[PDB]
Amino acid sequence: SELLVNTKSGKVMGTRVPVLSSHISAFLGIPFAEPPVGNMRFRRPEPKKPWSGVWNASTYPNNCQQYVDEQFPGFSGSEMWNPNREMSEDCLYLNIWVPSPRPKSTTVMVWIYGGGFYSGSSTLDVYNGKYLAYTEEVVLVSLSYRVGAFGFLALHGSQEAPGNVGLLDQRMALQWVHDNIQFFGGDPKTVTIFGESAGGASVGMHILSPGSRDLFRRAILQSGSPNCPWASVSVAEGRRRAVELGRNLNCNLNSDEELIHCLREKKPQELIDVEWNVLPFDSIFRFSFVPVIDGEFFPTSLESMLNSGNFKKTQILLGVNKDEGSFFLLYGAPGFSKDSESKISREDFMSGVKLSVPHANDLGLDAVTLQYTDWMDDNNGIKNRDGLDDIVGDHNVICPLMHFVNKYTKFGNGTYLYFFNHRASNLVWPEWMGVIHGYEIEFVFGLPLVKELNYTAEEEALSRRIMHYWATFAKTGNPNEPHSQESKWPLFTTKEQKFIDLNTEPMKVHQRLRVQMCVFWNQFLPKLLNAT
Amino acid sequence: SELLVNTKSGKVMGTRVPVLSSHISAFLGIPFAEPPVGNMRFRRPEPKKPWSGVWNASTYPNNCQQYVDEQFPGFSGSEMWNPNREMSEDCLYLNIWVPSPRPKSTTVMVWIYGGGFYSGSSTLDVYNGKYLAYTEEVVLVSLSYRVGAFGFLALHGSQEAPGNVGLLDQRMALQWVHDNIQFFGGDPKTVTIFGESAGGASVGMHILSPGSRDLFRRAILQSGSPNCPWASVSVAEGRRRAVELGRNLNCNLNSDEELIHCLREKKPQELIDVEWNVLPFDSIFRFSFVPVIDGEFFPTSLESMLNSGNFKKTQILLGVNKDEGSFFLLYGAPGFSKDSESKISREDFMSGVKLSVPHANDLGLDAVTLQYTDWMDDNNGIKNRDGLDDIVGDHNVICPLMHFVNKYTKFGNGTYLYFFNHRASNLVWPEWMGVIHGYEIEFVFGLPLVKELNYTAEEEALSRRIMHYWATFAKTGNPNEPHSQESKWPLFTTKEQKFIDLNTEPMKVHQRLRVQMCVFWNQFLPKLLNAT
Numbered sequence A, B: 001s002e003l004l005v006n007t008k009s010g011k012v013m014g015t016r017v018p019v020l021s022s023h024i025s026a027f028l029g030i031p032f033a034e035p036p037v038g039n040m041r042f043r044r045p046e047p048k049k050p051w052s053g054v055w056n057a058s059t060y061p062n063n064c065q066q067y068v069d070e071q072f073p074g075f076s077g078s079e080m081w082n083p084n085r086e087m088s089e090d091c092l093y094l095n096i097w098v099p100s101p102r103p104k105s106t107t108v109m110v111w112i113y114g115g116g117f118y119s120g121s122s123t124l125d126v127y128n129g130k131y132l133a134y135t136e137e138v139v140l141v142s143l144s145y146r147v148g149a150f151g152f153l154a155l156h157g158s159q160e161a162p163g164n165v166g167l168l169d170q171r172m173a174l175q176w177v178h179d180n181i182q183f184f185g186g187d188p189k190t191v192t193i194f195g196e197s198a199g200g201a202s203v204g205m206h207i208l209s210p211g212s213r214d215l216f217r218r219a220i221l222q223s224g225s226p227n228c229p230w231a232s233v234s235v236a237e238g239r240r241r242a243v244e245l246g247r248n249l250n251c252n253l254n255s256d257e258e259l260i261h262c263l264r265e266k267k268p269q270e271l272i273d274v275e276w277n278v279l280p281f282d283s284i285f286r287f288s289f290v291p292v293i294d295g296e297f298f299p300t301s302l303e304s305m306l307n308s309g310n311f312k313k314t315q316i317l318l319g320v321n322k323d324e325g326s327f328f329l330l331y332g333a334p335g336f337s338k339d340s341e342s343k344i345s346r347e348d349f350m351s352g353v354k355l356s357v358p359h360a361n362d363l364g365l366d367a368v369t370l371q372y373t374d375w376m377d378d379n380n381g382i383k384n385r386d387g388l389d390d391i392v393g394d395h396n397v398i399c400p401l402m403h404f405v406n407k408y409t410k411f412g413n414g415t416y417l418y419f420f421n422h423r424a425s426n427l428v429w430p431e432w433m434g435v436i437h438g439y440e441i442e443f444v445f446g447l448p449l450v451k452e453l454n455y456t457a458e459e460e461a462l463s464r465r466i467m468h469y470w471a472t473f474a475k476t477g478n479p480n481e482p483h484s485q486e487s488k489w490p491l492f493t494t495k496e497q498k499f500i501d502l503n504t505e506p507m508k509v510h511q512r513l514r515v516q517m518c519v520f521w522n523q524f525l526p527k528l529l530n531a532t
């Protein structure tokens, strides 16, 4: 039967799902690891033990335990990102959308959700892979991984809570795809991993980690890079936060053994309730439990690996959105509100700068302030607001990604860069937030093709073009079709550094994405902070 | 007789000079101090001993001993600034142009020549005061003062070479004007001192020095301020340079007495021949012997005086030119040449930055480089050239003047600011140099009114408007005529900070002159250099 597939782990029975007046096969909630529960909390994942009989893969799995956004109850803009399934530590499953009839050996794309490593679900409506699988005829997989303390609590030296286990969850899912996707009609030698935000940083981390490189062919990074300031911490800082978490839960801190034992006795929500109390600074765009530079998953520092070419050399497609920082300013910076234009005073601008670059000394803060202040009109509330927005986006996403692309391209086999600046016509968030962190995803997954979602004809066209760019890149390593009549997305080279905008207007090629600000963030500021 | 005037120092006989189809009286070469020769070299000036008989004031006096520019022999652009009279240490004289018939009690303007404190003459054709005196009907005086080691060698603690004697020369001339100008028809209570470059810095220094304040009514500063980085040195640095000068002349350095004795035995040219060898850094826009912050002429640091309002409170009119730095880049920066467009490579740009900000550490140099580099087009030779030009002008003239104007205006009684950006139609210097340091002077002195000089009709008009602004300001403290129909030059205020451009186009009012760069030079960079 088309819905019955026999894998090395056992048989699975999918379900026939409708999609754009047609149908495709969906295998939802396939386990790829043993439930990381009980004494398995914080520990590396273990392969799922093969099962007898048929596994019912007709419904989505549970979502991993995580902090839930309740800042705007009843508001779809925020709630569309929250878990839409019941949360459980038993959450290591993957979903597969397969074209009908079942392909023989077709391109595979594996989605890695974002969420700052503290949240995320593979089951969100915005991640429904049926449109992309159907339209581009690819086998689309979405995996899952532990987030928060459950996936990243790090007490280096310990084998019970070594850190990075969420990344190992991702790897195990990729391993399962490598070992079994052939049975679903997918080609294991042509797998493209793609993800947004923390998912994009993760994709980059697998490109770097020797233990992950052999599990995929090429990669796509959306609004995230392995070197982002929020994407990793040192083993020392990771240890400090784990201890502080224990301190928040009245744990015995005499030893790792005692600490871990205590943390394992706590209910999931107990850890989540104090998770944000372990941050070292009053900040925004900084998350508690994230990957740790351990000397194992990451042999050496990310920068030395990038400089020495110690990473998988293949083709990559990546990019950023126009206003990556607006979301986090709304949630944690003074002067910003969801229902106002959020014009910011010079006072709130300064406060915002300090929250955005928490690790900087006063000289560093002065440098940032001067770099983003128009002294001919310093009390302009709109300029102050947009300036802070740019600071947050440049520092946390754009400039780190630009540093990554330039370093990677020196050793890589092909780079394609984009700048997504289309503000959706049906966005529920205020206009001041612009092109928000994560809002290119709906276009990548083809939501604009669904009439009921209220997108414009132009937006359906943009989505189809994006899905085709992504799928063609996954299939060939080039988003452009051979001998096509359409505008060509040029290769990003060390010399010309070209990129294209992604919007409803005719294609435009540019060079040196935000180079002026990124020289500040990537070269000058770090030098200043190190000298002072 | 109209040409005979009896002063407190004795009688003087002037000469009738032609000017624009008319005539005026000129009293040239009037001594105001005893010749600072022999054992009087380096020492404070002494009042000129009254003389019997009639002093012949029909011809210009000698020019003070100074370095002579021989970089472009036969070229008027450079030679017009060199001494046009024989050089001698016996050079403390002043010149007076008086309207005919002799006024009774009219506005007086006293010119203080510039030249980086290492050069300058009151006798240059460009300083001929007959046009201004005639046209605006003011008594115009041009004084002189010792420059170079002769006027600024400083061995603090010694009374034989205390430093600042060139400034004391200026003061003595102002004292003479205060005591005698009434006999020439000038009003001693309505004297305006004005000067360019080092002359502008000097005007500001007299505003600051308690010993000079009572000698004038108001002031005009052109392309120079007391706080310019090249305008003064500490007593320690002044002492170091005096000793180094002696070292260059094989002097006994065992004591100030021995050093001074040796220096006094040397011929003038011997000192001049090694004057430039005492600079501490490889630099441009830095001169060897300049005013010293002695605790006498200047009670405390210039900045503390400015902050505390420890200065003469009156009205001031001041401004700068568009390209103040081009001249010094031509003479000392790599890549610049008089007969080429001087497009500069990134390499020469970096070298130029280091020469322009000699006191900065590498971090500081990086800060300047980033502030003036367009990273979207960093190899643009024209942008690099103009960028360096701006760095030199901003750092050495504009930003220091802007810091002065903002500090002064808080306590002053009226500030008028200008930005001179007119490139003369008959300029002999290359186009790349733009509106050069010192080239607004010819307009202030009315040279464009002389048909034979080849200026345009528009330039004659601009000159007349400038001369009238200057003279009206000197007369009333406001460059605008009461109940006039012409555009009004607004008062510069702490809040609106308005200024006007000075060119052949209709008046335009602007605000916050080069505020973005000046915040960098006046606030950020100093903080960076002090923290590192």
Ligand SMILES: *[C@@H]1O[C@H](CO)[C@@H](O)[C@H](O)[C@H]1NC(C)=O
Pocket (backbone or CB within 6 Å): A056, A058, A059
């Ligand atoms: C799970 O599999 C069973 C078959 O045993 C099927 O009837 C059911 O619809 C599947 N999912 C649900 C709705 O529980």
Ligand SMILES: *[C@@H]1O[C@H](CO)[C@@H](O)[C@H](O)[C@H]1NC(C)=O
Pocket (backbone or CB within 6 Å): A412, A413, A414, A491
């Ligand atoms: C990618 O590698 C192949 C050889 O494996 C080479 O022919 C090709 O030029 C490379 N492409 C780029 C853009 O580096």
Ligand SMILES: *[C@@H]1O[C@H](CO)[C@@H](O)[C@H](O)[C@H]1NC(C)=O
Pocket (backbone or CB within 6 Å): B056, B058, B059
């Ligand atoms: C100096 O004064 C004398 C009068 O004794 C006069 O003849 C002469 O022209 C003046 N200047 C010159 C030309 O030496």
Ligand SMILES: *[C@@H]1O[C@H](CO)[C@@H](O)[C@H](O)[C@H]1NC(C)=O
Pocket (backbone or CB within 6 Å): B412, B413, B414, B491
């Ligand atoms: C200057 O001072 C006088 C009082 O002496 C005052 O009336 C006038 O307002 C002041 N002008 C400015 C611009 O400060």
Ligand SMILES: [Cl-]
Pocket (backbone or CB within 6 Å): A018, A019, A020, A021, A450
């Ligand atoms: Cl549908």
Ligand SMILES: [Cl-]
Pocket (backbone or CB within 6 Å): A243, A253, A254, A255, A256, A259
């Ligand atoms: Cl411990």
Ligand SMILES: [Cl-]
Pocket (backbone or CB within 6 Å): A279, A280, A281, A282
């Ligand atoms: Cl805190």
Ligand SMILES: [Cl-]
Pocket (backbone or CB within 6 Å): A282, A283, A284, A331, A332, A333
């Ligand atoms: Cl916050």
Ligand SMILES: [Cl-]
Pocket (backbone or CB within 6 Å): A402, A403, A406, A518, A519, A522
């Ligand atoms: Cl970069």
Ligand SMILES: [Cl-]
Pocket (backbone or CB within 6 Å): A077, A426, A427, A428, A429
């Ligand atoms: Cl929306």
Ligand SMILES: [Cl-]
Pocket (backbone or CB within 6 Å): A427, A428, A429, A430, A431
């Ligand atoms: Cl809205």
Ligand SMILES: [Cl-]
Pocket (backbone or CB within 6 Å): B018, B019, B020, B021, B450
């Ligand atoms: Cl004439």
Ligand SMILES: [Cl-]
Pocket (backbone or CB within 6 Å): B243, B253, B254, B255, B256, B259
């Ligand atoms: Cl000595």
Ligand SMILES: [Cl-]
Pocket (backbone or CB within 6 Å): B279, B280, B281, B282
């Ligand atoms: Cl040197």
Ligand SMILES: [Cl-]
Pocket (backbone or CB within 6 Å): B282, B283, B284, B331, B332, B333
């Ligand atoms: Cl030089």
Ligand SMILES: [Cl-]
Pocket (backbone or CB within 6 Å): B402, B403, B406, B518, B519, B522
């Ligand atoms: Cl300023």
